Write an enzyme that holds these catalytic residues in place. Structure first.
Site, PDB file in Angstrom:
ATOM      1  CG  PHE A   1      16.690   2.135  10.365  1.00  0.00           C
ATOM      2  CD1 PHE A   1      15.660   1.634   9.586  1.00  0.00           C
ATOM      3  CD2 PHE A   1      16.577   2.060  11.742  1.00  0.00           C
ATOM      4  CE1 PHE A   1      14.545   1.065  10.169  1.00  0.00           C
ATOM      5  CE2 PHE A   1      15.464   1.493  12.329  1.00  0.00           C
ATOM      6  CZ  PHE A   1      14.447   0.995  11.542  1.00  0.00           C
TER       7      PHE A   1
ATOM      8  CG  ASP B   1      -5.426   8.115   4.250  1.00  0.00           C
ATOM      9  OD1 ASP B   1      -4.630   7.172   4.425  1.00  0.00           O
ATOM     10  OD2 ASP B   1      -5.067   9.308   4.160  1.00  0.00           O
TER      11      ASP B   1
ATOM     12  NE  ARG C   1       5.507   4.819  15.289  1.00  0.00           N
ATOM     13  CZ  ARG C   1       5.620   3.872  14.367  1.00  0.00           C
ATOM     14  NH1 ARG C   1       4.759   2.870  14.293  1.00  0.00           N
ATOM     15  NH2 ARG C   1       6.621   3.933  13.494  1.00  0.00           N
TER      16      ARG C   1
ATOM     17  NE  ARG D   1       5.046  -1.566   3.936  1.00  0.00           N
ATOM     18  CZ  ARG D   1       5.796  -2.538   4.436  1.00  0.00           C
ATOM     19  NH1 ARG D   1       5.838  -3.738   3.879  1.00  0.00           N
ATOM     20  NH2 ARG D   1       6.524  -2.301   5.523  1.00  0.00           N
TER      21      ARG D   1
ATOM     22  CB  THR E   1      -1.545   9.722   7.156  1.00  0.00           C
ATOM     23  OG1 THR E   1      -0.737   8.585   7.486  1.00  0.00           O
ATOM     24  CG2 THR E   1      -0.808  10.991   7.554  1.00  0.00           C
TER      25      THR E   1
HETATM   26 MG    MG Z   1      -4.269  11.170   4.292  1.00  0.00          MG
END
Ligand code: MG
Ligand code: D39
Ligand SMILES: *[C@@H]1O[C@H](CO)[C@@H](O[C@@H]2O[C@H](CO)[C@@H](O[C@@H]3O[C@H](CO)[C@@H](O)[C@H](O)[C@@H]3O)[C@H](O)[C@H]2NC(C)=O)[C@H](O)[C@H]1NC(C)=O
Ligand code: NAG
Ligand code: NAG
EC number: 7.6.2.1
Lengths: 328, 1035
Positions: B510, B379, B566, B737, B381
């Site tokens: 947005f 993963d 970013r 996603r 995050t």
């Molecule tokens: Mg995670």
């Protein structure tokens, strides 16, 4: 989750250790010291074994034109044979008289187990109640067999005697001791007579003899210290063998009082009471006389095996040394 | 079609509706003991030992006692049974806690409390703020205008940012109150239960009208309602139909590749065991015909034909040769497995100090599979990143700040202290106020956003749908400009501790294509400002000539982009009074639906954002976990391929890919559009992307690529293989996603079409399915739910600990297990095959060559401890050298230590050792051992000679095998021999060992068994040295 793991050498996989690596400086020598020790050992065993005077006589009488073929079909149960043998070199020191049996599978699983060690140990309860282990010879017809089992039933029962044919042609019987032919532990620990009483007749009451034995275990020997389960010949037999071809100690010829050889070289005749039938299964009876040696018995195999293995170590040592030098 | 009737518990009770209770456990209180069906059948060894126990039970055919087979068998079955019990009992506790969760339900007439179990389809519920969603509900009303709701879909995807959801317009204005919900009766004909999370097809039949439903109105079971006092919805999918539970795989019994190999090795041993016993059984039948029947001394009664005599010992020789597959091997494996697993727990270098959490080997069986890994699926995050997104640098006006030049943040009260800003020049400029650009720059951040306030317990906590805005608004607060609160028409901001309420007159939205946002706010004085913020490309496209900062900020953006930050460009304009008033009428007219509202909004939006003046640019840092880029490179040197499967957006996944250095400037990125052309090309015909080396695909593209009659199944089989072939030949693969089930199907695809050992690592419920699907599942600690941790085989806190788990614990565990298996078979084949050779010299009578008390204690006392320590304390190279040379890991990847070739070589070694162990004593005894009144050549001496030569040889062999000679290792090797020669010297048998010949035979037998091995081992390493040997040689 939980607290910090405690810091120890075992738990952190950092125990003090030694990392051996098979380097040329460690394996090349041992392939030479071993070869340098196995060659003299092989010579030492090999020469000593060859320095043992030993005569083996096969009196089974299977082949014709032999003076024992008459006992293979014993019309009369007491049969005798006379085998004449010559010793070119006189025997020295103590001489052991064995009897050899061939193709006699005493190591059979069905045979090795056929005994009652509890009864042989001198157990009153097991004396009249032999274990089911010796099932085929538990009870003869009504009461239990004292030496139960196929091992005790099939006891070697030939009588071997040696005569020296002197210059006068009159045979000279040679004294043969039947004592001290079994292990000390066997006589005094493993094998004992049943407890109580003073006469062996009373101790072995309500116990029939084995089927194949001619006379009961009462009078295996006249000496009270050599009769019953503590009989030397019976003890030697029950101590089973590992391979079909084996020999068991039978008699002892102690050192003669005089300086003369124990068995001076000359003419000898073996007077044997043929009783044990072995030719049914192509077995072969034998009699062996051997002379004691400080370095065990007569084993040509080990001496040759050390020479072979000792020499091969040099070949590997040189080959490894040569291979290393190419790939150094 | 799924049908749901509101406030009707008996509409479809006339089973197909699943009650809202979940069931993840496997064993009840009754069907637990029948797990033996699972233990016995899957592993054929357990069945074989069961056959032995039954076979040894019948006295008719027996040669060894059975009490020595039942007790170890219970240990082998018992330990695994208890391990599954504690694991399953834990799963009961999780289900109980989830099931007993409290909620509110429309029972008859009123909202009355109920548990999650009592929820059913067609059940109206009320959920307060920060409450878990108990089932897939259709949002009806809320506490805030337009029935607007926010959810945290942390279990659907690992993201924490709020998700935006609405309700139907008609239901919003009628179902606000409890009373109308009680009498609410709406019929829904929605789709059947499925695992698709981003799509929903259904319509609400209510008030004689049909209203289509979309995913924006459905709150799923894994969601958490946030920043809204209360909301109402009617359950649609409950319990097992919920999309989160359809996105959940079964808990399988995971076993190692070596475990499977041993099954194939043991199958061959059975074939030899039957063939050896059958061959010896035949020989006895022949022997009994010729020799046995004519042997009077062997008569025993119970006349049996030689055919029957041969039949009986076939089972006798099965019992004599039973240790060809020994039960002690499997009793010892559990000890090795438990010890190897506790070294992961005890590891101080896999222990996270500040969180105070060590590693945990939650599954003790898969230790040696950590040395087999080919693919890692991770993963993003919380696994690769810390989930913290801070404001790092900014190019305010022309100058670049945040350069550690010359913070306490005590000058402003709202400063929470999260920010770790080090530059002091920026702080001085803000307080000084010499440059108005600095004040306007941070004012824009606190204005142009959709971030939302919490203001709970006096804490000014912020929640946002986009983490970038949440970080920028948090940063603005730390610099005095705190976003206090916002109403429908105005926004309140504290400018350096001074309250200031701006009345917003228009908020630009947005969009993915828009890639920017702006806002029209009227200052209290009267001026109107268009505060804009967006991507560099779109922003610069809408500049004007006088802007002199075009080049300076362009260079700054490149500097920010160099360190993978970013960035967003900030702009403002000075709208007049009449200009906005004329346009506001136009903008309001565009707000109506009219025809589409999309083209009209886009047109007016573009004209709004012309002639913009720049304030600067921002640089947000998505923090990586410590040692992540160093770990990814290190594991790549071990030829381990790392795939990133994340539920986040493609833009964030790609950005972290560059930060992790999975993607570099040399990599050419292939997207879903590129792949579909190539896969189609191969279909209508090693892949050209073999040199491209990168692959970024979205979850939607995965469905199309995977395409998820007989010919259709072939295309499904073919298309999946083509994608896996293409994807596997890429340096990095990033799937974004993807749903929790799509994470597992990617792991399964590699497992099926590549035969690769896979590792799944992650945190949160999003990664539980792939943690359960992969061969090894790792759970990163940190989530209060502890759902990925609880379902994982191993669990530590930092991604960087994957180096020690694989390159030290997994690498060693493979070496120690393979060494253990190869020796344990050898020591038992060399032990049990002596009976095979002796069969030719005892009439094939199944007589054993050893004493009975030696056969029982062999694997217990005389050869037990030394191999256990070698399987627990053996290290070819230290941990430091293990991590310095990841190339050593490739040894286990290719299965170079345990194979058919390596296994059969241990049988040949055992067959030759037993051959030597029998035939040298045989030769030394066939003629004359030292013979006198007190002499061997007995059967007891023959058994003592082989047993003594066997114990010394096998104990010397493990000494050669052992490479880490600790004092415990040395003591056990010489202690096992000293114990054998101590037990049989009164602490008959001792008598043989006092003869020079009996000891000369043993010395000769040992050397012939060991010297050829020493030559081969030395010869093997000199011409074919291994990687470990070279490191140790040059150590
Ligand atoms: Mg995670
Ligand atoms: C003077 C210094 C001496 C120091 C060392 C001396 C050695 C002391 C050793 C101590 C440890 C003993 C380990 C025993 C291993 C079990 C092997 C086994 O199982 O051998 C079964 C028989 O074993 C048993 O009877 C029960 C064993 C229970 C084990 C207890 C739990 C494990 C203890 C772990 C100890 C860990 C110690 C600490 C570790 C850090 C027969 O295998 P098998 O023959 O293949 O088949 C027979 C044939 N199928 C049939 O049907 O007859
Ligand atoms: C020396 O030992 C041998 C055994 O090797 C003895 O031969 C065995 O003698 C017994 C009788 O005591 C035989 O058992 C049965 O004998 C009856 C006659 O009493 C006979 O009718 C049965 O058919 C059966 O043979 C036994 O068969 C026999 N062994 C063999 C192989 O034939 C021998 O008697 C012993 N002699 C001495 C002097 O100890
Ligand atoms: C063996 O000796 C005996 C008695 O001395 C004699 O009768 C017999 O003929 C001899 N046999 C042989 C083959 O010498
Ligand atoms: C041999 O021994 C037997 C019995 O002891 C005896 O009768 C015989 O005379 C001896 N001599 C022989 C057979 O030449």
């Amino acid at each position: 989750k939980t607290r910090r793991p405690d810091n120890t050498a075992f738990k952190q996989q950092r125990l003090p250790a030694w990392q051996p690596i098979l380097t040329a400086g460690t394996v090349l020598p041992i392939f030479f010291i071993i070869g340098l020790i196995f060659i003299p050992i092989g010579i030492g065993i090999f020469v000593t074994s060859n320095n043992i005077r030993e005569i083996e006589i096969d009196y089974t009488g299977t082949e014709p034109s032999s003076p024992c073929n008459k006992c293979l079909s014993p019309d009369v149960t007491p049969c005798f044979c006379t085998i004449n043998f010559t010793l070119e070199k006189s025997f020295e020191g103590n001489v052991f008289m064995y009897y050899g049996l061939s193709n006699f599978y005493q190591n059979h699983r069905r045979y090795v187990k056929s005994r009652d060690d509890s009864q042989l140990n001198g157990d009153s309860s097991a004396l009249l109640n032999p274990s089911k282990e010796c099932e085929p010879y538990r009870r003869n017809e009504d009461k239990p067999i004292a030496p139960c089992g196929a091992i005790a039933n099939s006891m070697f029962n030939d009588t071997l005697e040696l005569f020296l044919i002197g210059n006068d042609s009159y045979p000279i019987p040679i004294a043969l001791k039947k004592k001290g032919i079994a292990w000390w532990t066997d006589k005094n620990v493993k094998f004992r007579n049943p407890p109580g009483g003073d006469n062996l007749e009373e101790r072995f009451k309500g116990t029939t003899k084995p089927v194949n034995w001619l006379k009961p275990v009462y009078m295996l020997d006249s000496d009270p210290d050599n009769n019953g389960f503590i009989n030397e010949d019976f003890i030697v037999w029950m101590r089973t063998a590992a391979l079909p071809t084996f020999r068991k100690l039978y008699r002892l010829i102690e050192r003669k009082s005089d300086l003369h050889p124990t068995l001076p070289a000359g003419r000898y005749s073996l007077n044997v009471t043929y009783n044990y039938p072995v030719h049914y299964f192509d077995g072969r009876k034998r009699m062996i006389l051997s002379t004691i040696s400080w370095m065990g018995g007569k084993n040509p195999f080990l001496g040759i095996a050390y020479i072979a293995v000792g020499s091969i170590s040099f070949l590997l040592g040189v080959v490894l040394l040569v291979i290393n030098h190419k790939y150094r | 079609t799924w049908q749901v009737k509101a406030n009707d518990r008996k509409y479809h009770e006339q089973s197909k509706y699943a009650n809202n209770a979940i069931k993840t456990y496997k064993y009840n209180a009754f069907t637990f003991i029948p797990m033996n069906l699972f233990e016995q059948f899957k592993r054929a060894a357990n069945l074989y030992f069961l056959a032995l126990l039954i076979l040894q039970a019948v006295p008719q055919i027996s040669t060894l006692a059975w009490y020595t087979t039942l007790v170890p068998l219970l240990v082998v079955l018992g330990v695994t049974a208890i391990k599954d019990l504690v694991d399953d009992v834990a799963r009961h506790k999780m289900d109980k806690e989830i099931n007993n969760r409290t909620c509110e339900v429309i029972k008859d007439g009123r909202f009355k409390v109920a548990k999650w179990k009592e929820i059913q389809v067609g059940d109206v519920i009320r959920l307060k703020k920060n409450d878990f969603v108990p089932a897939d509900i259709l949002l009806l009303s809320s506490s805030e205008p337009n029935s607007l709701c926010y959810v945290e879909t942390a279990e659907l995807d690992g993201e924490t940012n709020l998700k935006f959801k609405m309700s139907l317009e008609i239901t919003d204005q009628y179902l606000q109150r409890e009373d109308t919900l009680a009498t609410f009766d709406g019929f829904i004909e929605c789709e059947e239960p499925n695992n698709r999370l981003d799509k929903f097809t259904g319509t609400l039949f209510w008030r004689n009208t049909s209203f289509p439903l979309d995913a924006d109105k459905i709150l799923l079971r894994g969601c958490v309602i946030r920043n809204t006092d209360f909301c109402h919805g009617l359950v649609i999918f409950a319990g097992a139909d919920t999309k989160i539970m359809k996105n959940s795989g079964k808990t399988r019994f995971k076993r190692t590749k070596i475990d499977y190999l041993m099954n194939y090795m043991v199958y061959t041993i059975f074939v030899v065991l039957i063939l050896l016993s059958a061959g010896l059984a035949i020989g006895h039948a022949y022997w009994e015909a010729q020799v046995g029947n004519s042997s009077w001394y062997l008569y025993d009664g119970e006349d049996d034909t030689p055919s029957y005599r041969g039949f009986l010992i076939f089972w006798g020789y099965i019992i004599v040769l039973n240790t060809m597959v020994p039960i002690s091997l499997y009793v010892s494996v559990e000890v090795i497995r438990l010890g190897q697993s506790h070294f992961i727990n005890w590891d101080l270098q896999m222990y996270y100090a500040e969180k105070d959490t060590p590693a945990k080997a939650r599954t003790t069986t898969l230790n040696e599979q950590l040395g087999q890994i080919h693919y890692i699926f991770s993963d993003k995050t919380g696994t690769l990143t810390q989930n913290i997104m801070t404001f790092k640098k900014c190019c305010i006006n022309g100058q670049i700040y945040g350069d550690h030049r010359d913070v306490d943040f005590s000058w402003n009260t709202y400063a929470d202290g999260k920010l770790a800003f080090y530059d002091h020049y920026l702080i001085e400029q803000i307080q000084s106020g010499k440059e108005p650009e600095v004040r306007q720059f941070f004012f824009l951040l606190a204005v142009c956003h959709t971030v939302m306030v919490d203001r709970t317990d006096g804490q000014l906590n912020y929640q946002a749908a986009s983490p970038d805005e949440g970080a920028l608004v948090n940063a603005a607060r730390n610099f005095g400009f705190a976003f206090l609160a916002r109403t429908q028409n105005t926004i309140t901001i504290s400018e350096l501790g001074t309250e200031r309420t701006y009345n917003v007159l228009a908020i630009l939205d947005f969009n993915s294509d828009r890639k920017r946002m702006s806002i029209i706010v009227r200052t209290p004085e009267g001026n109107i400002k268009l505060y804009c913020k967006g991507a560099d490309t779109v922003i610069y496209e809408r500049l004007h000539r006088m802007n002199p900062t075009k080049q300076e900020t362009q260079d700054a953006l490149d500097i920010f982009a160099n360190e993978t930050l970013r960035t967003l460009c900030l702009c403002y304009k000075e709208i007049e009074e009449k200009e906005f008033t004329e346009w506001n009428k136009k903008f309001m007219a565009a707000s109506v639906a009219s025809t589409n509202r999309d083209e009209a909004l886009d047109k007016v939006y573009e004209e709004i954002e012309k002639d913009l003046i720049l304030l600067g640019a921002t640089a947000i840092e998505d923090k990586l976990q410590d040692g992540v880029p160093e770990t990814i490179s290190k594991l790549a040197k071990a030829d381990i391929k790392i795939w990133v499967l994340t539920g986040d957006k493609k833009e964030t996944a790609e950005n972290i890919g560059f930060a992790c250095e999975l993607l570099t400037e040399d990599t050419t990125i292939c997207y879903g559009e590129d792949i579909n052309s190539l896969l189609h090309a191969r279909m209508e015909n090693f892949f050209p992307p073999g040199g491209n080396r990168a692959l970024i695909i979205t979850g939607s593209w995965l469905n199309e690529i995977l395409l998820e009659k007989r010919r259709l199944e072939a295309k499904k089989e073919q298309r999946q293989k083509n994608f896996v072939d293409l994807a596997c030949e890429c340096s990095a693969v990033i799937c974004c996603r993807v749903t929790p089930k799509q994470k597992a199907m990617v792991v399964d695809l590699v497992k099926r079409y590549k035969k690769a050992i896979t590792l799944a690592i992650g945190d949160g419920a999003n990664d539980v399915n792939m943690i359960k699907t992969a061969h090894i599942g790792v759970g990163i600690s940190g989530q209060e739910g502890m759902q990925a941790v609880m379902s994982s085989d191993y669990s530590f806190a930092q991604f960087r600990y994957l180096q020690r788990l694989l390159l030290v614990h997994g690498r060693w565990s493979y070496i120690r297990m393979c060494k253990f298996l190869r020796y344990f078979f050898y020591k038992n084949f060399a032990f049990t095959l002596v009976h095979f050779w002796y069969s030719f010299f005892n009439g094939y009578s199944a007589q054993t060559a050893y004493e009975d008390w030696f056969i029982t204690l062999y694997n217990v006392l005389y050869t037990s401890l030394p191999v256990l320590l070698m399987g627990l304390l053996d290290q070819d190279v230290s941990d430091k050298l293990s991590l310095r040379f990841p190339g050593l890991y490739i040894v286990g990847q290719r299965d170079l230590l345990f194979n058919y070739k390596r296994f059969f070589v241990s049988l040949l070694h055992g067959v030759l050792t037993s051959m030597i162990l029998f035939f040298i004593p045989l030769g030394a005894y066939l003629q004359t051992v030292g013979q006198d009144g007190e002499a061997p050549s007995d059967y007891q001496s023959f058994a003592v000679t082989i047993a003594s030569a066997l114990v010394i040889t096998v104990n010397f062999q493990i000494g050669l095998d052992t490479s880490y000679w600790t004092f415990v290792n040395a003591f056990s090797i010489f202690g096992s021999i000293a114990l054998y020669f101590g037990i049989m010297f009164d602490f008959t048998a001792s008598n043989a060992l006092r003869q020079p010949y009996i000891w000369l035979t043993i010395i000769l037998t040992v050397a012939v068994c060991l010297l050829p091995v020493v030559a081969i081992r030395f010869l093997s390493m000199t011409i074919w040295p291994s990687e470990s040997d070279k490191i140790q040689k040059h150590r």
